[PDB]
Amino acid sequence: LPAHLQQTFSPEEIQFIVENEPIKIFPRITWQLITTDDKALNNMVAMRSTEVVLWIALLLKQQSKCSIVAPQWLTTKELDRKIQYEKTHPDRFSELPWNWLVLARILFNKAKDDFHDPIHELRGKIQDLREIRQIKVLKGLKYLNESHLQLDNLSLLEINELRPFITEIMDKLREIHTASL
Amino acid sequence: SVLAAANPIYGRYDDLKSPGDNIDFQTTILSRFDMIFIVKDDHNEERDISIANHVINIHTGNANAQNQQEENGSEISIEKMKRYITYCRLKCAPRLSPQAAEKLSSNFVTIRKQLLINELESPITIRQLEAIIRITESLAKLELSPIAQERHVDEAIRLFQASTMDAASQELKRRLPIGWSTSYQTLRREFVDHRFSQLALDKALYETIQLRHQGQNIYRSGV
Amino acid sequence: VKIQPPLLRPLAYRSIKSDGLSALAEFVGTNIGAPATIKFLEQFDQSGVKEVIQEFKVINASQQQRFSYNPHKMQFIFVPFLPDIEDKVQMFLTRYYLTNDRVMRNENSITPIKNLLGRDAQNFLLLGLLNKNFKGNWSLEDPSGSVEIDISQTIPTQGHYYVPGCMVLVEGIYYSVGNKFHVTSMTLPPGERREITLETIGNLDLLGIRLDKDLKIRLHLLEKELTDHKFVILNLFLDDLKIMTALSKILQKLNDDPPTLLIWQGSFTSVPVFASMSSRNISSSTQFKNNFDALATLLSRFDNLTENTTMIFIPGPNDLTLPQDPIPSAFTKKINKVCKNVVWSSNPTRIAYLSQEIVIFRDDLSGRFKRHRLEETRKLVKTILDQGHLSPFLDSLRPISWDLDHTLTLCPIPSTMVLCDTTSAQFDLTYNGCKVINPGSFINRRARYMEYVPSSKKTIQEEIY
Amino acid sequence: YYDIDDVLADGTEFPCKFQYDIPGLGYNPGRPITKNTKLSLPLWLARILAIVGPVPFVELLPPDMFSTKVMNAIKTDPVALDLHSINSHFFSLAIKWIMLFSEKELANVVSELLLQRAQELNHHASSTSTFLLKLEEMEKEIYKKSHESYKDTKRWMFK
Amino acid sequence: MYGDLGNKLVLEAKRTKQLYARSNQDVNLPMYHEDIIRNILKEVSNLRKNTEYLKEQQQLGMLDDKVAKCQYFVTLLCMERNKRCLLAYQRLRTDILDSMAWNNNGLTNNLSHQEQEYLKEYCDLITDLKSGDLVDIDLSGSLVPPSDVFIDVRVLKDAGETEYGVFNLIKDSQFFVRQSDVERLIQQGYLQKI
């Protein structure tokens, strides 16, 4: 009986969930895993784009047999327009890849070499936008009452850690209210 | 909380006359204290050599100063003890235990009786009970536990009894009032010169307090 | 034990059938290494592999365990030349606390001595040891103080045997004016039966096998079936022709009927040790050695015995204070060479019976009880069974070895205690289950002895005259 | 029930006087106590004591903890109010009392108080001085959970 | 003062939770206080003995008065209260042992015998379920998801030593090895760094 969390998923568990994400790569080679879901494919041509699940790419990157392409959505100018959109939208939490947090943490571990000067550049941007998002959560969070909760757009990680608070409180509210009848 | 360090008049001789004769005003200040200890000075050659070379090792060659492996094994620091006391005072809420209370109630009777024995045939207050009872929680504050126990409290009886016993402390009668020299040698002689047997002597002999005192002295004196 | 058989299987693999490998994995499973399991497995036709993979007593007083009682936890601990002082101090403490738990099982209250002397008025049935310090100064003692007791105009009960050095119960008042506790009636603390007692011991081991697993009815069944285990009980000297004659007729009756368990009593010699005159060129040692040789000769005269019969030696009061290590090997060398089912038990000893507690102890209890009472047979038995101890006497009377008092403790109640008394007649009576026997003398009873059947618990006397 | 808070919640004594004569005082040697004797009684027993009749067995006098001075005092400035001295079990207790009495107003009051408390308690949650000590039990337990959630989150960021 | 023993025991349970909070989990339950349990039993026994007594006397001198039924109804609740305290106490008391049965199996003495009886049957029962799967589960351990795939572990007082190959456990010697065998040896505490 693990007991933890038990309601929340462990951070490493959600990391285990994001393992399932497919991603494009550039293998060094120029197989037939029978396990479960890949089913693909023939030996790939070197420096050519092919979509593969995350953890296998992590393996190949550990052996340096693949050249990971950087995700196109992650470009500093795009985060600038996001932050722009954020300063003008007190309510909407607009666009997030939703898994992007853990990605960036992992991409900067190894995939850092392929990107063009991410160092001291986007890292600050993601942090800045992250915290402004957190507080905008807090501003909408003061409004909390049954029965609606505005969940709109957020990365799953933060939703998971904030889960115990709101989940355990709202029940009390509903109970006392309905119970009063 | 006040900590005292006195000197009686004339040094070690104050205990050779009557055991009082120390505070010239009165004994009510000591009754308003908690613990009274008397430091003596008895020669023991092994203890004397040990206290000698123990102190030479303190001055020179840092023999007692080994402490670093002791730090590795016991009491790593003084400042550690201070941080621990800060944590200990406000957290625990000590109180005695109900099964241990009847023990102290039966014990205060014995101490007051002890003073009756030394007084009427020849100063305890309830504040003395108040002193006994607080040491229990002090060691409890070390254990950090919220209750008190039987075995955890009775250790204090030894420590307090050690501090106050030093504070308190037809033939014979019409033959030798002083009682000296009239014992088993002379007594065996007198009776000899017809029911006395050496074994019977030690049995029947064992409230003339003279025999008690003689036992303390005349025994190894031989007569 | 914990193991993973899937990990185990490739190791086992280095063809072999799954049934054989699985079977050996299961069987060897209880044995485990750190692991060493590889070393045992590598040591290992199907018949050869199957065989290769496979690879009722008497309690020794000197080799028994030790368990200590804790008043706080009310349980025992894993305790394990001369003993220590702390042991001597904790000796009397353990008796009182065992009796203490026995009182709590029998549910007009419990209060120590200091509490009543702490008071001055009244009314209690105090529990303690009847000691005595001075003339008229009959003291009572618990772990919290002493108090003088008086029996001035007391009409106590018709108890088993009120003796000093015994934990008793007396009702009365303190009256601290003269500070003399008074007695209304002296009574003895009751002892409960062995059934409920063994029910409440828990589920551990008090006899030697760690838990309790006495749930094998085959034990009781086999005893009810195997009448093959018969006991023979015989004071017994060695330097008389009368003894030789008796042994002749006895071995004549034993060469015919093969017995199973011989119980050779104590006192193998009419005289003690401490020789100081070499006039007749001998000593107690040489004489005793020759007596053993004569006994070995009489024993070797008939080889029908020892073929299927086990023997037991018992040291008496005149050999080289309780307990006592047995007779040395130096005087039993020849007998140990000739025979093969001999043993040298301490006095007392216990036979480790799969479902019963048989104890053997030889001494004179009644020869001391008449001279130590304050102011019949059942009284004696009642005393020993109710007190739960073999020696209810002070250590200034009976010097007890500090290490093995636990052995002497009657915790729990035994099944049958063999008490060989040298001053009372022979009997066997029952009292709350523990069958207490007595064989009496052996020579002056015009050559009588006893033979006991454990299954039907029958008791028969056998006499040659 | 098996929740520690349940037996804990029913443990508090409530001063509610009975409507009838009561032989066999459970708390003195009268033996019967005359009607309308106010005595504090545990919530578990006293809860259903008057439920049985159809006249109730207990008057169920209003709680001192629920006094108008208390209720408006809490309506004023929730952040500073100390719930720990007065009960300390409050939300979990008041819900039980309010179920028995069935008033709709103060429920609607207390709920907002709880909301602001939540706001504030989550504000200390990110990582004091003396406030952190006065919080009721339920909020304390949630605080521990939230603390480990964030500690472990940032720790999850690196090693 | 009445259901007071229940308050002390329930409270001790409550503290034992917090005692187990971080903690590290070194949890060795102090003891089973059966003396207090005995006190409960004595009070209930006295109560229901008087209760049955009045229940009999109700046909003679009480004459089934309406007020008399109240005390039965009271003591019944009180009984439930006592019960409730012991139930919950034991349920948590049991639960913590159950957790200790899961975590380190794996792959005391001071506590009351009934617990060990239940414990031994519980562990035997969970081994029965381990026999059922045959999956394999391995359901009691392997709580953390694996990555990636090899790790460097150091020996913790183990020398030693075997699965698939004998690796010759040597005291104070750190290795670089896959998670697999490490999972078994860590259950015995023989490995330290993860």
Side-chain angles (χ1 to χ4, degrees), chain A residues 1-4 6-7 11-14 16-22 24-25 27-34 36-51 53-75 77-82 84-119 121-135 137-148 150 152-181, chain B residues 1-54 56-69 71-105 107-117 119-138 140-169 177 179 200 204 215 222, chain C residues 1-3 5-8 10-20 22-48 50-51 53-159 162-173 177-272 275 283-421 423-465, chain D residues 1-9 11-12 14-24 26-40 42-70 72-80 82-104 106-120 122-145 147-152 154-159, chain E residues 1-4 6-9 11-15 17-30 32-33 35-36 38-45 48 50-57 59-78 80-99 101-104 106-110 112-116 118-123 125-134 136 138-146 148 150-151 154-155 159-160 162 164-168 170-183 186-194:
Chain A
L1 296 187
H4 305 157
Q6 65 201 358
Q7 292 75 2
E12 190 278 339
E13 292 172 354
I14 60 182
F16 186 81
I17 299 174
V18 69
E19 293 176 355
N20 306 318
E21 293 307 325
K24 277 181 177 304
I25 62 175
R28 299 290 182 276
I29 72 172
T30 181
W31 41 108
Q32 178 92 67
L33 214 33
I34 293 137
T36 63
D37 42 352
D38 55 0
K39 184 191 67 178
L41 193 49
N42 196 348
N43 68 335
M44 305 168 185
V45 170
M47 307 299 89
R48 172 176 299 181
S49 175
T50 174
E51 185 76 1
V53 66
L54 169 63
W55 63 270
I56 70 172
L58 183 159
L59 183 153
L60 282 182
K61 186 70 165 60
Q62 183 175 0
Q63 189 177 352
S64 69
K65 297 191 67 61
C66 65
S67 303
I68 171 64
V69 68
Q72 75 293 359
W73 68 263
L74 185 158
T75 301
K77 52 190 187 58
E78 174 275 342
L79 292 169
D80 302 335
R81 78 179 61 189
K82 294 302 173 298
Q84 279 182 347
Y85 186 97
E86 191 58 23
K87 285 180 180 182
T88 179
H89 292 86
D91 297 336
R92 288 184 287 178
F93 295 98
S94 77
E95 284 187 353
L96 288 186
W98 164 82
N99 32 20
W100 55 281
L101 293 176
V102 188
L103 309 184
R105 172 179 182 272
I106 294 178
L107 301 180
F108 297 161
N109 295 137
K110 290 165 291 297
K112 56 181 180 63
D113 51 352
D114 298 342
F115 310 152
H116 53 81
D117 194 70
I119 57 183
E121 184 69 14
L122 287 72
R123 314 191 288 174
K125 269 72 176 172
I126 66 90
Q127 186 48 261
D128 184 19
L129 189 152
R130 179 182 182 279
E131 187 73 20
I132 67 180
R133 178 170 295 270
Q134 179 172 349
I135 57 93
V137 175
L138 190 159
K139 71 174 292 182
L141 185 154
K142 66 180 62 176
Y143 299 138
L144 288 183
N145 283 319
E146 69 285 12
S147 294
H148 184 68
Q150 294 179 345
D152 273 330
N153 295 304
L154 183 53
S155 183
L156 185 48
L157 182 158
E158 299 173 344
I159 297 165
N160 198 345
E161 60 179 357
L162 63 80
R163 179 185 302 186
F165 185 79
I166 306 88
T167 53
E168 180 171 25
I169 291 167
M170 300 295 187
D171 293 340
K172 308 289 184 297
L173 286 63
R174 171 179 60 66
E175 185 279 328
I176 57 92
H177 178 280
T178 57
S180 169
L181 186 155
Chain B
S1 64
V2 178
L3 199 151
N7 289 318
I9 48 96
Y10 299 103
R12 63 177 64 89
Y13 181 71
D14 199 3
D15 295 331
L16 297 174
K17 292 176 72 177
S18 70
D21 295 329
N22 199 3
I23 294 172
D24 198 6
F25 290 101
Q26 60 188 357
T27 61
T28 70
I29 298 97
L30 303 178
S31 67
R32 288 196 296 273
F33 281 108
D34 294 329
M35 294 179 69
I36 298 96
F37 276 164
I38 299 170
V39 174
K40 299 295 289 183
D41 45 354
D42 290 330
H43 63 279
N44 285 316
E45 290 84 2
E46 296 181 355
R47 181 178 179 268
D48 202 3
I49 297 169
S50 71
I51 194 64
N53 200 0
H54 181 270
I56 277 95
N57 295 315
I58 292 171
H59 285 89
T60 175
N62 66 12
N64 290 138
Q66 290 180 0
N67 285 139
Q68 295 179 359
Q69 294 93 22
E71 301 302 326
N72 199 2
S74 65
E75 299 295 327
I76 57 98
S77 177
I78 291 95
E79 65 182 1
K80 189 73 176 294
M81 186 60 67
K82 183 183 283 186
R83 181 67 179 170
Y84 177 74
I85 292 170
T86 59
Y87 185 80
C88 284
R89 183 168 288 174
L90 56 92
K91 288 293 193 293
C92 71
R95 183 180 174 180
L96 61 95
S97 65
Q99 70 276 16
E102 61 189 0
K103 177 68 173 65
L104 299 174
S105 68
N107 197 2
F108 186 78
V109 174
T110 58
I111 296 171
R112 195 175 185 93
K113 282 296 292 181
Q114 182 63 43
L115 197 276
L116 187 147
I117 293 301
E119 196 273 331
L120 191 274
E121 293 179 353
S122 66
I124 55 97
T125 64
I126 65 169
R127 291 191 296 273
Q128 295 302 110
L129 192 152
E130 194 272 340
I132 293 168
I133 198 66
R134 293 180 293 172
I135 312 299
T136 63
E137 292 87 6
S138 65
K141 190 172 286 292
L142 295 172
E143 288 289 327
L144 195 146
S145 67
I147 62 169
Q149 296 172 356
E150 181 66 30
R151 66 167 179 84
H152 197 279
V153 168
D154 294 335
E155 183 179 2
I157 285 95
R158 294 177 180 88
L159 193 145
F160 176 74
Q161 196 59 255
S163 177
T164 57
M165 289 303 293
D166 293 330
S169 65
Chain C
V1 64
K2 60 279 297 182
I3 61 164
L7 288 295
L8 190 172
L11 295 180
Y13 175 77
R14 297 175 80 186
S15 295
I16 184 170
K17 186 62 179 177
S18 180
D19 293 354
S22 300
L24 54 77
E26 180 190 2
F27 293 151
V28 178
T30 301
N31 197 186
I32 193 168
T37 302
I38 189 71
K39 191 256 182 81
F40 277 159
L41 179 66
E42 66 196 352
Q43 297 297 323
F44 296 156
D45 198 359
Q46 279 181 352
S47 179
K50 287 174 175 182
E51 293 181 339
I53 62 168
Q54 297 180 23
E55 290 78 4
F56 181 76
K57 293 294 288 184
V58 174
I59 294 168
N60 291 342
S62 68
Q63 302 171 356
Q64 213 268 334
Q65 311 298 318
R66 191 70 166 83
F67 283 155
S68 178
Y69 183 77
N70 188 4
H72 183 77
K73 294 181 180 180
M74 291 193 289
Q75 64 181 355
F76 305 94
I77 321 166
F78 287 107
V79 181
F81 165 70
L82 293 167
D84 302 334
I85 299 169
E86 301 174 354
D87 313 339
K88 181 182 177 182
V89 183
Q90 294 173 355
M91 175 180 177
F92 291 95
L93 289 177
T94 306
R95 288 190 174 183
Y96 197 84
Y97 282 110
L98 180 61
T99 312
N100 190 0
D101 178 75
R102 195 173 67 192
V103 165
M104 292 306 292
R105 289 181 180 178
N106 201 2
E107 293 292 326
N108 199 1
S109 178
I110 302 161
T111 294
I113 281 178
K114 193 172 182 179
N115 194 3
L116 293 176
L117 282 178
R119 289 183 62 196
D120 54 352
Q122 64 272 19
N123 277 327
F124 180 63
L125 179 62
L126 197 58
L127 170 68
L129 284 169
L130 288 172
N131 306 328
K132 185 175 182 178
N133 284 321
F134 303 98
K135 186 178 179 183
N137 193 348
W138 296 95
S139 65
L140 205 69
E141 179 186 5
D142 68 352
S144 68
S146 298
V147 51
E148 178 172 1
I149 318 295
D150 193 1
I151 55 166
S152 64
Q153 295 176 355
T154 299
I155 44 168
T157 62
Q158 296 173 356
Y162 295 103
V163 290
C166 174
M167 289 174 183
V168 298
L169 297 167
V170 287
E171 199 271 330
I173 49 96
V177 180
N179 200 359
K180 51 172 72 175
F181 182 79
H182 289 178
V183 174
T184 302
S185 176
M186 302 181 286
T187 183
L188 289 168
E192 200 173 3
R193 66 178 182 176
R194 190 184 68 189
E195 185 170 357
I196 295 171
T197 308
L198 292 174
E199 175 187 1
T200 61
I201 55 164
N203 289 316
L204 297 179
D205 190 1
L206 283 171
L207 204 70
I209 285 95
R210 283 180 171 86
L211 307 180
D212 191 4
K213 299 295 288 295
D214 294 333
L215 290 177
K216 275 76 195 166
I217 196 168
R218 189 179 177 180
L219 301 170
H220 178 74
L221 181 59
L222 284 175
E223 180 172 354
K224 196 173 182 179
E225 291 178 353
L226 292 179
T227 67
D228 310 334
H229 298 164
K230 189 173 282 189
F231 304 147
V232 175
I233 292 169
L234 280 79
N235 194 2
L236 174 63
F237 306 105
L238 290 175
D239 51 0
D240 185 3
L241 184 59
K242 300 181 183 180
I243 309 296
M244 300 165 67
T245 301
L247 284 170
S248 301
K249 292 180 183 176
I250 283 165
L251 292 172
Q252 178 184 2
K253 306 171 166 181
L254 296 178
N255 281 318
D256 297 330
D257 189 3
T260 305
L261 207 61
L262 278 181
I263 294 97
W264 278 359
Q265 291 297 317
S267 178
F268 288 100
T269 304
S270 71
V271 299
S283 168
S284 177
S285 67
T286 62
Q287 190 67 40
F288 193 49
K289 185 188 288 184
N290 296 318
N291 293 315
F292 274 109
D293 300 332
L295 185 57
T297 303
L298 281 171
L299 195 61
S300 296
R301 281 178 60 189
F302 308 105
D303 294 333
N304 292 320
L305 199 62
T306 316
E307 291 176 351
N308 290 310
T309 301
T310 312
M311 293 187 61
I312 298 170
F313 294 174
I314 284 167
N318 304 320
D319 302 331
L320 185 68
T321 301
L322 305 182
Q324 40 188 347
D325 52 350
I327 298 170
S329 68
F331 293 156
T332 62
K333 187 181 289 184
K334 279 194 175 184
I335 298 171
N336 201 2
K337 287 183 181 180
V338 170
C339 295
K340 293 177 183 178
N341 300 318
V342 294
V343 74
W344 301 271
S345 69
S346 294
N347 187 5
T349 185
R350 297 168 181 172
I351 292 175
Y353 204 66
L354 297 176
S355 293
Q356 284 186 355
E357 309 173 358
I358 295 175
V359 184
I360 302 173
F361 176 75
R362 197 268 181 199
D363 204 71
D364 295 335
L365 265 298
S366 300
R368 289 195 298 270
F369 280 175
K370 195 174 180 181
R371 292 199 304 268
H372 292 282
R373 64 180 182 269
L374 293 171
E375 64 180 0
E376 294 181 352
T377 60
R378 288 182 178 179
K379 299 288 195 179
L380 178 62
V381 173
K382 181 179 174 184
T383 300
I384 302 301
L385 288 179
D386 288 333
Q387 280 292 320
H389 206 60
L390 299 169
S391 297
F393 286 95
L394 293 170
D395 293 348
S396 71
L397 200 58
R398 295 280 78 76
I400 294 172
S401 179
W402 300 338
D403 279 334
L404 300 173
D405 194 13
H406 167 66
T407 60
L408 296 174
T409 311
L410 299 179
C411 179
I413 306 301
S415 300
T416 299
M417 188 180 292
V418 179
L419 293 182
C420 304
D421 182 79
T423 186
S424 69
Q426 62 180 358
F427 59 93
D428 185 5
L429 288 177
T430 183
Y431 186 74
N432 204 358
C434 184
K435 305 291 182 176
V436 179
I437 67 167
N438 186 11
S441 171
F442 176 76
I443 292 301
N444 286 321
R445 300 304 303 161
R446 65 185 81 186
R448 297 173 188 173
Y449 74 97
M450 305 303 294
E451 292 177 354
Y452 172 70
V453 172
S455 68
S456 297
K457 299 167 75 171
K458 298 175 179 176
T459 304
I460 53 171
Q461 304 186 358
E462 288 190 356
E463 180 183 2
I464 75 166
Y465 186 78
Chain D
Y1 178 68
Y2 295 156
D3 178 20
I4 60 175
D5 313 332
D6 301 344
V7 60
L8 183 46
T12 59
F14 291 154
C16 304
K17 69 181 183 63
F18 304 153
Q19 185 68 53
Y20 299 138
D21 182 16
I22 46 165
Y27 299 137
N28 181 24
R31 186 60 67 184
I33 307 181
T34 188
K35 65 181 185 62
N36 299 318
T37 296
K38 187 179 60 179
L39 290 178
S40 66
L43 174 54
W44 49 281
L45 52 94
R47 186 175 69 186
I48 57 184
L49 279 189
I51 296 302
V52 178
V55 176
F57 291 159
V58 186
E59 179 68 13
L60 298 173
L61 193 153
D64 58 345
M65 69 207 69
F66 291 157
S67 301
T68 182
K69 183 183 71 64
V70 184
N72 62 10
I74 76 192
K75 298 171 60 62
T76 58
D77 282 337
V79 179
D82 177 6
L83 295 173
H84 178 62
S85 68
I86 68 176
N87 296 328
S88 72
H89 306 289
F90 180 74
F91 298 100
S92 59
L93 184 150
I95 186 59
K96 301 185 177 60
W97 166 264
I98 205 175
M99 280 316 95
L100 173 66
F101 181 80
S102 184
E103 163 202 351
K104 174 61 173 56
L106 69 83
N108 191 22
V109 178
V110 184
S111 179
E112 181 56 26
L113 176 160
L114 181 66
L115 180 156
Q116 288 305 320
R117 286 295 187 87
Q119 301 292 320
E120 188 281 336
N122 191 24
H123 298 168
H124 290 288
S126 295
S127 70
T128 75
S129 58
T130 185
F131 160 81
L132 187 155
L133 183 152
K134 70 175 59 176
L135 287 63
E136 175 176 357
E137 190 64 16
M138 61 177 292
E139 171 190 8
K140 182 186 297 182
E141 186 276 339
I142 69 92
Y143 180 77
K144 296 292 187 301
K145 307 172 61 172
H147 192 44
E148 296 305 320
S149 71
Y150 292 97
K151 278 172 70 177
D152 183 71
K154 188 163 71 69
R155 281 192 301 99
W156 183 91
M157 284 298 179
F158 309 97
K159 305 174 176 181
Chain E
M1 71 182 70
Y2 195 78
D4 58 339
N7 306 329
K8 315 299 178 296
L9 178 147
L11 188 60
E12 185 277 337
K14 167 180 180 58
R15 74 178 302 171
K17 298 180 58 177
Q18 309 294 104
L19 290 179
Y20 173 73
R22 183 172 176 262
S23 48
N24 193 345
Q25 160 198 8
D26 209 348
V27 48
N28 270 129
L29 282 63
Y32 181 81
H33 303 66
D35 50 350
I36 184 56
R38 293 185 185 88
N39 310 134
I40 310 166
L41 298 169
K42 285 184 288 293
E43 183 179 3
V44 57
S45 296
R48 59 187 182 102
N50 302 289
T51 293
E52 66 184 357
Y53 168 71
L54 312 176
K55 187 172 177 298
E56 182 274 342
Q57 187 182 7
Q59 184 182 358
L60 290 59
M62 304 297 86
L63 298 175
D64 194 10
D65 182 73
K66 178 66 175 180
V67 173
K69 175 179 176 297
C70 300
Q71 295 74 9
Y72 301 93
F73 183 78
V74 167
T75 59
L76 167 62
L77 300 182
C78 189
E80 306 178 344
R81 183 64 164 186
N82 304 131
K83 179 180 295 298
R84 179 67 63 180
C85 293
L86 310 171
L87 302 171
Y89 170 76
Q90 185 54 270
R91 178 172 184 87
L92 181 58
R93 171 60 62 94
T94 302
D95 193 10
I96 181 60
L97 311 179
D98 290 345
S99 77
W102 286 91
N103 59 355
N104 55 46
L107 200 35
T108 56
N109 59 345
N110 194 175
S112 61
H113 188 59
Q114 302 178 343
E115 304 305 313
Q116 185 173 8
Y118 182 82
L119 185 152
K120 74 189 177 55
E121 180 176 357
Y122 179 80
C123 67
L125 190 157
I126 189 54
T127 60
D128 295 338
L129 283 303
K130 301 178 176 60
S131 67
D133 303 318
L134 184 45
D136 59 342
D138 290 338
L139 72 163
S140 190
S142 63
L143 177 58
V144 175
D148 193 78
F150 302 151
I151 307 90
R154 187 172 300 101
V155 172
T162 302
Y164 302 141
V166 283
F167 296 154
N168 288 331
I170 291 300
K171 176 50 174 67
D172 290 334
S173 179
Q174 74 178 6
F175 299 150
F176 177 75
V177 176
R178 76 175 56 182
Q179 180 63 242
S180 309
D181 297 347
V182 174
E183 296 161 355
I186 187 179
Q187 290 304 98
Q188 211 169 348
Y190 287 9
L191 309 186
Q192 185 61 43
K193 188 181 59 55
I194 300 181

